[PDB]
Amino acid sequence: DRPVIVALDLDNEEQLNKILSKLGDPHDVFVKVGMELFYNAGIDVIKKLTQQGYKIFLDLKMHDIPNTVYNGAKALAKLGITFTTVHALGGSQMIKSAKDGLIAGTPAGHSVPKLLAVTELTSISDDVLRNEQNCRLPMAEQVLSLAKMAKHSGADGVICSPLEVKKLHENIGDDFLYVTPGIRPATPKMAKEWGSSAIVVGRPITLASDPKAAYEAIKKEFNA
Amino acid sequence: DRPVIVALDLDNEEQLNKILSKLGDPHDVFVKVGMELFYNAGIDVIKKLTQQGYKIFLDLKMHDIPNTVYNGAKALAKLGITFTTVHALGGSQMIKSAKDGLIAGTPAGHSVPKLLAVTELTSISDDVLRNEQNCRLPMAEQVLSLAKMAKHSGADGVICSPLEVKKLHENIGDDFLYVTPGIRPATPKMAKEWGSSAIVVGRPITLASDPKAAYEAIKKEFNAENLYFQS
Numbered sequence: 001d002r003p004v005i006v007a008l009d010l011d012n013e014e015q016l017n018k019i020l021s022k023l024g025d026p027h028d029v030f031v032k033v034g035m036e037l038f039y040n041a042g043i044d045v046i047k048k049l050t051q052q053g054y055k056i057f058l059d060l061k062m063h064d065i066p067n068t069v070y071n072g073a074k075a076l077a078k079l080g081i082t083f084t085t086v087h088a089l090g091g092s093q094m095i096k097s098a099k100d101g102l103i104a105g106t107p108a109g110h111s112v113p114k115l116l117a118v119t120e121l122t123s124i125s126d127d128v129l130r131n132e133q134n135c136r137l138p139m140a141e142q143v144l145s146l147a148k149m150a151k152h153s154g155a156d157g158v159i160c161s162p163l164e165v166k167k168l169h170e171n172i173g174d175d176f177l178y179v180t181p182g183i184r185p186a187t188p189k190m191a192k193e194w195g196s197s198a199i200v201v202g203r204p205i206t207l208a209s210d211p212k213a214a215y216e217a218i219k220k221e222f223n224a
Numbered sequence: 225d226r227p228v229i230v231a232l233d234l235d236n237e238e239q240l241n242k243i244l245s246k247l248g249d250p251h252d253v254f255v256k257v258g259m260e261l262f263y264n265a266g267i268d269v270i271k272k273l274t275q276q277g278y279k280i281f282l283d284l285k286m287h288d289i290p291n292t293v294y295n296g297a298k299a300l301a302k303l304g305i306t307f308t309t310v311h312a313l314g315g316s317q318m319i320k321s322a323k324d325g326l327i328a329g330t331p332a333g334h335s336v337p338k339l340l341a342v343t344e345l346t347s348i349s350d351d352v353l354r355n356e357q358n359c360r361l362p363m364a365e366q367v368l369s370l371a372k373m374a375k376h377s378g379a380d381g382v383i384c385s386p387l388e389v390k391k392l393h394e395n396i397g398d399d400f401l402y403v404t405p406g407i408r409p410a411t412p413k414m415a416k417e418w419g420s421s422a423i424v425v426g427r428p429i430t431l432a433s434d435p436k437a438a439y440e441a442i443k444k445e446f447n448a449e450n451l452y453f454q455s
């Protein structure tokens with residue numbers, strides 16, 4: 001049974017509590033929150049939620065020098081989170097320090113958060129990759145490069161498009177998490193067949209008439 | 225007029241309060257905190273500090289899609305900080321959104337935080353630039369390109385090394401902040417001479433036997449515009 005993660009887009013604790021109350025029992029609920037929430041809420045907000053049993057993909061895409069990311073990651077791990085992201089663009093050493101940091105901050109009797117690398121953000125078009133980022137390679141090649149390197153450096157997985165998972169998965173093998181966002185009922189069943197380890201789903205659930213029923217139905221479409 | 229910013233590399237509010245007690249009157253102190261502190265202490269600690277009159281460079285290097293950075297940046301401007309960072313590698317639109325977010329989150333009356341672009345981190349060597357990040361440009365060209373783009377995208381300044389200021393300035397000009405961290409008694413004097421808008425200083429101050437006097441001496445050196453007589 002592979003996890004379905006609900007992507008949340010909200011900017012306060014109150015909104016967060018409200019959607020979570022609509023998603024189900026805490027143990028059954030895996031959500032993604034980024035900096036729009038984390039930078040707007042008290043430091044103990046995530047910790048309180050993970051104490052209750054909520055699983056949290058805290059998506060802050062850390063991108064700094066290795067020693068600072070060691071310490072950032074370490075601080076995050078003490079929140080009780082399940083997944084977290086770094087930019088592969090920050091390089092091999094930074095990624096390794098990120099994992100060492102996660103290990104260091106994981107409190108007794110907890111699983112170490114999984115370290116996921118971001119490659120090229122979805123906001124990066126072909127033109128931006130070439131003319132703004134001054135990359136030497138086209139998209140498909142840049143992405144595979146970063147993902148491979150992330151795997152070599154101690155990342156547990158990568159955030160990748162559902163339409164890349166096939167070929168990424170071919171290259172890097174089964175010992176890695178391929179976490180695919182942008183899934184809509186690219187359906188959950190297609191993501192399963194193409195090799196996704198976890199799907200991230202937003203509005204189809206969060207904007208649903210009954211977010212809980214939507215969330216539960218996607219899990220079944222993903223795991224049937 | 226030109227700021228000296230104290231880099232605080234610590235992970236707890238109690239150690240923070242101790243170094244701060246030695247830096248002087250809050251209205252005379254400008255500090256830099258990054259992931260290490262912020263991800264342990266959170267927003268209340270920053271709000272507390274800025275309300276007292278501390279100037280904070282909150283250095284979190286946001287790097288995400290434009291809409292998310294808009295909201296991240298907006299969240300940070302509510303805290304009353306002075307400088308904050310984003311990755312130029314995140315692209316032109318992300319930088320513009322960051323600045324718009326900063327504007328939206330600033331309380332009325334208050335001053336909009338300055339948006340500073342990170343270019344290539346000091347952790348990226350030429351080999352890392354070439355063979356990990358798959359850049360097609362050599363370091364100096366890539367740095368200038370990222371800096372120029374940041375200027376054209378609403379950034380108020382860049383983080384660069386003291387030595388880089390001249391090339392960046394030559395191309396970008398005076399309506400921009402060149403913020404330079406490597407500084408130790410590259411000296412404050414050299415940083416001044418080379419056109420740094422602001423320096424960040426760490427251990428030379430935070431581990432000095434008298435941090436306040438080390439700080440004031442560096443402010444003085446950095447701002448010695450007419451150090452020598454000339455006619």
